[PDB]
From a paper:
Five tubulin-binding cofactors (TBCs) are implicated in late-stage tubulin folding and heterodimer assembly 1,5–10. TBC-B and TBC-E are implicated in binding α-tubulin, whereas TBC-A and TBC-D interact with β-tubulin. TBC-B comprises an N-terminal ubiquitin-like (Ubl) domain and a C-terminal cytoskeleton-associated protein with glycine-rich segment (CAP-Gly) domain.
Limited proteolysis produced two polypeptides, one of which, the Ubl domain, gave highly ordered crystals, and the structure was solved with anomalous dispersion methods 14. The N-terminal Ubl domain of TbTBC-B crystallized in the tetragonal space group P41212 with a single polypeptide in the asymmetric unit. The Ubl domain is a small globular entity consisting of a mixed four-strand β-sheet that forms a concave groove in which a single α-helix is placed. This is an example of a β-grasp fold, a common structure involved in protein–protein interactions 5–11. A pronounced hydrophobic core is present, formed mainly by aliphatic side chains. The residues involved, which have < 10% solvent-accessible surface area, include Val4, Val6, Leu8, Tyr22, Ile28, Ile31, Val35, Thr41, Met46, Leu48, Leu50, Met62, Leu68, Cys73, Ile79, and Val81 (not shown). These core residues are, in general, conserved among the TBC-B family of proteins. The surface residues are more variable, perhaps indicative of a module that does not interact directly with α-tubulin. Intriguingly, and despite only low sequence conservation, the Ubl domain of TbTBC-B contains two lysines (Lys34 and Lys62), which correspond to Lys27 and Lys48 of ubiquitin, and a structural overlay reveals strong structural similarity in terms of the positioning of these residues. A striking similarity is observed in the spatial location of two functionally important lysines in ubiquitin, and strongly supports a biological function for the Ubl domain, and by implication for TBC-B. Through reversible post-translational modification, TBC-B can influence aspects of tubulin biology in a proteasome-dependent manner.
Residue numbers in the entry: 2 to 87
Write the structure that this text describes.
């Protein structure tokens, strides 16, 4: 029902080592929370779900879907791809 993940960011060396999300949470709600750490506007984020073996499960999770749709598990990595322009 809840997962422990880490957060990485495509435009920085910044890592957040432990984060707990509900699998029922929409990806949009997760991006909101992610903003508290990296401060990319959520409209300019894609979330890539990587498993604990480094394998990409989803390159860009849809805002209206829930994290559990993507079969997220403990120790997985949500990588934030930063698309914000100039």
């Amino acid at each position: 029902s809840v997962v422990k993940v880490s957060l990485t960011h495509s435009a920085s060396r910044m890592r957040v080592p432990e984060k707990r999300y509900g699998l029922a949470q929409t990806i949009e709600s997760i991006k909101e929370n992610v903003f508290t750490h990296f401060a990319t506007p959520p409209e300019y984020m894609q979330l890539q779900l990587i498993d604990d073996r480094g394998i990409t499960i989803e390159k860009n999770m849809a805002n209206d879907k829930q994290l559990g749709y993507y079969q997220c598990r403990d120790e997985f990595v949500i990588h934030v791809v930063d698309l914000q322009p100039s």
